[PDB]
Amino acid sequence: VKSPPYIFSPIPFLGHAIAFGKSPIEFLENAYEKYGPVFSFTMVGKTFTYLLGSDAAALLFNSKNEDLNAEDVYSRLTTPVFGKGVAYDVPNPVFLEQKKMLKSGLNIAHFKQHVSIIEKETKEYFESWGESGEKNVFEALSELIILTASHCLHGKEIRSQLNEKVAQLYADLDGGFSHAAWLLPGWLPLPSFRRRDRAHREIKDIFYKAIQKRRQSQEKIDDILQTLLDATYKDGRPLTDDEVAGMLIGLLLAGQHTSSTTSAWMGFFLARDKTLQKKCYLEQKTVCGENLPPLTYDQLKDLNLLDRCIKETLRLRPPIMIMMRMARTPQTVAGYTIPPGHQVCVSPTVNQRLKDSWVERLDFNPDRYLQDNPASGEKFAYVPFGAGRHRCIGENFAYVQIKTIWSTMLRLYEFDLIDGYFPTVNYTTMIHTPENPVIRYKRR
Amino acid sequence: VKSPPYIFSPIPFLGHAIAFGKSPIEFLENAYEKYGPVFSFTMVGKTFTYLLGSDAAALLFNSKNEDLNAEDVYSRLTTPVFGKGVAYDVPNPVFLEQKKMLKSGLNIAHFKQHVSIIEKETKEYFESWGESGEKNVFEALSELIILTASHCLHGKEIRSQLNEKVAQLYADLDGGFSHAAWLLPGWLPLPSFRRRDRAHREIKDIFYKAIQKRRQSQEKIDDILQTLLDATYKDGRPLTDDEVAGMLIGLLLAGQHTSSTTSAWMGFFLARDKTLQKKCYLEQKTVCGENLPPLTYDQLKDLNLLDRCIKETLRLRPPIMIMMRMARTPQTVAGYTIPPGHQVCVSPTVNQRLKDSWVERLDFNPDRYLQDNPASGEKFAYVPFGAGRHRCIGENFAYVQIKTIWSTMLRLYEFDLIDGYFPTVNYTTMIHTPENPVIRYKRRS
Numbered sequence A: 001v002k003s004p005p006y007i008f009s010p011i012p013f014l015g016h017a018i019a020f021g022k023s024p025i026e027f028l029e030n031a032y033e034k035y036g037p038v039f040s041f042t043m044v045g046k047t048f049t050y051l052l053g054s055d056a057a058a059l060l061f062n063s064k065n066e067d068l069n070a071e072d073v074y075s076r077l078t079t080p081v082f083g084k085g086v087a088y089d090v091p092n093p094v095f096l097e098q099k100k101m102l103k104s105g106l107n108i109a110h111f112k113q114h115v116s117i118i119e120k121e122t123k124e125y126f127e128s129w130g131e132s133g134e135k136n137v138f139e140a141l142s143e144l145i146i147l148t149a150s151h152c153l154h155g156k157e158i159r160s161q162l163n164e165k166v167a168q169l170y171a172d173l174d175g176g177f178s179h180a181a182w183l184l185p186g187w188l189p190l191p192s193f194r195r196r197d198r199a200h201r202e203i204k205d206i207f208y209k210a211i212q213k214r215r216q217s218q219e220k221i222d223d224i225l226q227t228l229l230d231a232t233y234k235d236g237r238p239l240t241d242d243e244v245a246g247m248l249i250g251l252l253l254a255g256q257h258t259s260s261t262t263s264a265w266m267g268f269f270l271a272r273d274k275t276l277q278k279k280c281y282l283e284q285k286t287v288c289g290e291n292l293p294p295l296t297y298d299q300l301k302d303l304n305l306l307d308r309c310i311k312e313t314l315r316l317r318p319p320i321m322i323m324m325r326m327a328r329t330p331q332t333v334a335g336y337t338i339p340p341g342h343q344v345c346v347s348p349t350v351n352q353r354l355k356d357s358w359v360e361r362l363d364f365n366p367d368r369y370l371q372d373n374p375a376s377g378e379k380f381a382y383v384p385f386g387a388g389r390h391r392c393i394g395e396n397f398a399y400v401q402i403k404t405i406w407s408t409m410l411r412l413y414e415f416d417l418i419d420g421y422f423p424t425v426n427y428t429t430m431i432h433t434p435e436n437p438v439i440r441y442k443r444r
Numbered sequence B: 001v002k003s004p005p006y007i008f009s010p011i012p013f014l015g016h017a018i019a020f021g022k023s024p025i026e027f028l029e030n031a032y033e034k035y036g037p038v039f040s041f042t043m044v045g046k047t048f049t050y051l052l053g054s055d056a057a058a059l060l061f062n063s064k065n066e067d068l069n070a071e072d073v074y075s076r077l078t079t080p081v082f083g084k085g086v087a088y089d090v091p092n093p094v095f096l097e098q099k100k101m102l103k104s105g106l107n108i109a110h111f112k113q114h115v116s117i118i119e120k121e122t123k124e125y126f127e128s129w130g131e132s133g134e135k136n137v138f139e140a141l142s143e144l145i146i147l148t149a150s151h152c153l154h155g156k157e158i159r160s161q162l163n164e165k166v167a168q169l170y171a172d173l174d175g176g177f178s179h180a181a182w183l184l185p186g187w188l189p190l191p192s193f194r195r196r197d198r199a200h201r202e203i204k205d206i207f208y209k210a211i212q213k214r215r216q217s218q219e220k221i222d223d224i225l226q227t228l229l230d231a232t233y234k235d236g237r238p239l240t241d242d243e244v245a246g247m248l249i250g251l252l253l254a255g256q257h258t259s260s261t262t263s264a265w266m267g268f269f270l271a272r273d274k275t276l277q278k279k280c281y282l283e284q285k286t287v288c289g290e291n292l293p294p295l296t297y298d299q300l301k302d303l304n305l306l307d308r309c310i311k312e313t314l315r316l317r318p319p320i321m322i323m324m325r326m327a328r329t330p331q332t333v334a335g336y337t338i339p340p341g342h343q344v345c346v347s348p349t350v351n352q353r354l355k356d357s358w359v360e361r362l363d364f365n366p367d368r369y370l371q372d373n374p375a376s377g378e379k380f381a382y383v384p385f386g387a388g389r390h391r392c393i394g395e396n397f398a399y400v401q402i403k404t405i406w407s408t409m410l411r412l413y414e415f416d417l418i419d420g421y422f423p424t425v426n427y428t429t430m431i432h433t434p435e436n437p438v439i440r441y442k443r444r445s
């Protein structure tokens, strides 16, 4: 019985809050060098054990929620946003069943509807950008993906309900994913806290309309919303309008920022490497045809450089930078015993550029997978959508959304850095955004 | 006409204060990577331009004080501590004459007196350490250096006055060297300013009577104090007691924490590398004889290995991390022009560790000066004592003090890391101290 190596700190309560908050990746890498794959440190009165590399990460991924708990650590910020009865407000096994319902709605038949739907929105959004200029790509992508995600994961009913003042209510909901919502108790009246809670009530209320609007129309519509309204537990109990609305919010959030971010980054990687940008466009012609017809799901499967470009963007910029659990029981990894109380953590980001197992780690090189790599060489070195019980379900949909958008975007425009500026990473938010994400764009 | 590359910060007033504050060398080397030898950034509403590498630092080192001025940047810290009419409170030509006088005291005749003074102080101090144990070297060293530096630089009369009270007065003065004193206006009253001011008066008062008393006795004492009492500007004008008192405070502050931090680090470099440590002890025997007799200045010149260990310590841990100037007129380096108003900096630490010119840069290797190295291969790669008009005058004394101390310390003890711990650097203060500088020791064979 032995404790993970502990990283002592000068500052009594803050701990490593300032060094880690400043640049978590450098911090975690420096710690990996000095202390190894399993270590502890204190931030803001809380102790964190991190698991780095595949072997160590294995513990968090392979474990039961009974032993490494996700609600204990997420409820604080998620439950106020998504709502009661949904996600981390219920016991895990109840959650899994809701996960299976959402899974059902994410299949090839729906994805075939999604492709053309997203393609139209993309084309129609970018009518405002004209033939050339300099605009913020991430904000454009943020707005577009709020349109595409809603169109696909919510109904046409809800998509037709989106205006300026609804995006504001979504923005209010984003402000729930904060530094402060995690650390500070909910009973404090902060600006962001009231802002968020106001929007939750409103948007639940807006979803109540559209659920009622569809529950009553007879036209057989087969999208994701229908899948939810039709589903049932092992019980045989259908979902309450509340439950449904709860998981509609969870879909909107999961599906929006994780794809805007990633799309935005890939933009800058492709603008920095103009040869690779050219090859992606060439592959568009080679696969789909020189006449560039509207996109099909079946064509997507064959855009393999684009696919690896997305694989590689997610490698160097996974939007979920950290996974967390609470140790409810003692757990053993690498010979260390993590005591109950620690928040146990894995970082895809660190794992995915770890010097031990990636060649030219900081290089944007989608051909790395066409060689030997730990993404197939190792279990948990490449892990942007997690693994085990808490593993993602949006991977196919996120690949469809991003793929369609960038196909359309490369068809519209050639992209370039402004004065060679490659954006750095903003760590002031759990939304990890590119700093000043403005690209130059020529018509193709 | 082009200004240096500038590093932007989101944070409005503070700018890079946190990123620089936390790890300056890390910050500066990453900046070197992205931007090159010359760049500018801002902290707490001040803009800094750094000159990294021999070629760039040549600007600061070669420049005249009118162009790149030190009073403008040092005075707020310095004058309150040393007092008026001294150092950076007077125009630079006046300071040079002052430096010339101090220099004339730092000669071989006095250094020979110093050796046997310092050795005795060292032997006597470390009697409280006993056969073995675990103690805080850095604390022991600063305590010791206060005694040795006073004895050598102030004289026997002042050293006999050194008690618990006076040690506290000096520590209050040290408190004047805060980042706070550099940033915040002097009419504010933090606890530490009051202390600095009160202690400045009480120390001057002590030095006054000490100066008075020797100006009177007939004992022909040939030391650094007498050199000051007998000195004269080109004028013909001798120093007033307040000037003598000033530079005496200057001397103790100067010759104290520079030697104590450097000695402490060397302790840790020697404890980390045990076969190096033993070779140093063998050198003692090989040079001074097997009997290990009392140290002499002459013997110190032939301790080449210990010399290079100090040289190498100063290379990796120079006590003065940043030298600074105010730009009064515009200056040009590497094609860039620094506007008047920027604070222009060099860091010996960064220069002395630069991938480009240092083979295995982070390695403590005293024998690197027996190969081809940039200390002789370049101009300003190795500059722990500065260069140009503001060049240090204390190097020879520093070496005498540290060699004598560590020579003795090696004869007395063998040193070890506690649990393989090597202290990291404390940056929260201007005395760049080692973290938890406790060392293991046992009586040497």
Ligand SMILES: OC[C@H]1O[C@@H]2O[C@H]3[C@H](O)[C@@H](O)[C@@H](O[C@H]4[C@H](O)[C@@H](O)[C@@H](O[C@H]5[C@H](O)[C@@H](O)[C@@H](O[C@H]6[C@H](O)[C@@H](O)[C@@H](O[C@H]7[C@H](O)[C@@H](O)[C@@H](O[C@H]8[C@H](O)[C@@H](O)[C@@H](O[C@H]1[C@H](O)[C@H]2O)O[C@@H]8CO)O[C@@H]7CO)O[C@@H]6CO)O[C@@H]5CO)O[C@@H]4CO)O[C@@H]3CO
Binding pocket: A003, A004, A005, A006, A007, A008, A009, A010, A035, B419, B421, B424, B435, B436
């Ligand atoms: O000696 C090296 C160390 O010195 C300085 O640390 C001081 C620090 O600045 C102050 O904060 C204070 O420490 C108090 C601390 O704040 C409290 O948390 C508490 O500490 C207790 C721990 O909570 C508890 O876990 C246990 O500690 C044991 C560890 O659990 C166990 O793993 C092991 O620790 C070893 C580490 O695992 C290993 O990594 C290595 O530690 C290195 C550190 O990681 C590194 O940061 C540095 O530490 C410096 C530090 O920077 C200084 O500021 O080097 C270390 C090399 O040793 O080795 C560890 C063993 O040394 O064992 C420990 C038990 O030894 O108990 C502790 C109480 O002991 O109370 C503290 C009250 O002092 O003071 C410290 C000491 O000067």
Ligand SMILES: OC[C@H]1O[C@@H]2O[C@H]3[C@H](O)[C@@H](O)[C@@H](O[C@H]4[C@H](O)[C@@H](O)[C@@H](O[C@H]5[C@H](O)[C@@H](O)[C@@H](O[C@H]6[C@H](O)[C@@H](O)[C@@H](O[C@H]7[C@H](O)[C@@H](O)[C@@H](O[C@H]8[C@H](O)[C@@H](O)[C@@H](O[C@H]1[C@H](O)[C@H]2O)O[C@@H]8CO)O[C@@H]7CO)O[C@@H]6CO)O[C@@H]5CO)O[C@@H]4CO)O[C@@H]3CO
Binding pocket: A419, A420, A421, A424, A435, A436, B003, B004, B005, B006, B007, B008, B009, B010, B035
């Ligand atoms: O633009 C004119 C500028 O040109 C020269 O600077 C170049 C520099 O020498 C190159 O090294 C390189 O600099 C890179 C830079 O170091 C990186 O940090 C990065 O910068 C991006 C930021 O990371 C990102 O945050 C954002 O910047 C925004 C700021 O965060 C925000 O505060 C605000 O900027 C305000 C400034 O804070 C404020 O001081 C003021 O700035 C003006 C300067 O004071 C003035 O000297 C001049 O700068 C010259 C510079 O001296 C040349 O050497 O004009 C400045 C701006 O007009 O005014 C701002 C208030 O609006 O807004 C910015 C958004 O711009 O984005 C930046 C830029 O991508 O990227 C750089 C790599 O390209 O390039 C620069 C520029 O060519």
Ligand code: HEM
Binding pocket: A070, A099, A102, A106, A251, A254, A255, A256, A258, A259, A262, A314, A318, A319, A320, A323, A324, A383, A384, A385, A386, A387, A389, A390, A391, A392, A393, A394, A395, A397, A398
């Ligand atoms: C690039 C896009 C995406 C990435 C990189 C991503 C990443 C992740 C990661 C890392 C996890 C594991 C979290 C943990 O273990 O703590 C996860 C879980 C999950 N994701 Fe995503 N996601 C993306 C898009 C989506 C989409 C579009 C949806 C909705 C269809 C979604 C819904 C979910 C759900 C329901 C979970 C399960 C949470 C749990 O079981 O505790 N994600 N995702």
Ligand code: HEM
Binding pocket: B070, B099, B251, B254, B255, B256, B258, B259, B262, B318, B319, B320, B322, B323, B324, B383, B384, B385, B386, B387, B389, B390, B391, B392, B393, B394, B395, B397, B398
């Ligand atoms: C190892 C110990 C020492 C180191 C590393 C050191 C370092 C330095 C450095 C880097 C400078 C240049 C300052 C600048 O340009 O900003 C300097 C200047 C100076 N030092 Fe030292 N020093 C040491 C010991 C001493 C001692 C013992 C004395 C007095 C006996 C002393 C007195 C001075 C003086 C008078 C200056 C000139 C300041 C000026 O002209 O602006 N130093 N020293």
Ligand SMILES: CC(=O)N1CCN(c2ccc(OC[C@H]3CO[C@](Cn4ccnc4)(c4ccc(Cl)cc4Cl)O3)cc2)CC1
Binding pocket: A074, A078, A087, A182, A250, A251, A253, A254, A255, A258, A320, A322, A323, A324, A392, A394, A430
């Ligand atoms: C203290 C500290 O150092 N830190 C505070 C906590 N910090 C953190 C916060 C949240 C987090 O996230 C995990 C939870 C919350 O969000 C998702 C991630 N997600 C998003 C899309 N797919 C998955 C999620 C799951 C299902 C659904 Cl329906 C929707 C979503 Cl948003 O899992 C991960 C890390 C890490 C940094």
Ligand SMILES: CC(=O)N1CCN(c2ccc(OC[C@H]3CO[C@](Cn4ccnc4)(c4ccc(Cl)cc4Cl)O3)cc2)CC1
Binding pocket: B074, B077, B078, B087, B179, B182, B250, B251, B253, B254, B255, B258, B320, B322, B323, B324, B392, B394, B430
């Ligand atoms: C904002 C910022 O980034 N920062 C704050 C200011 N920072 C700084 C502060 C002081 C400094 O110091 C140079 C001046 C001050 O002190 C000496 C150094 N000194 C000591 C011994 N030998 C030389 C000195 C010279 C002669 C005599 Cl008589 C006595 C002394 Cl104390 O020169 C150098 C740098 C640099 C870091």
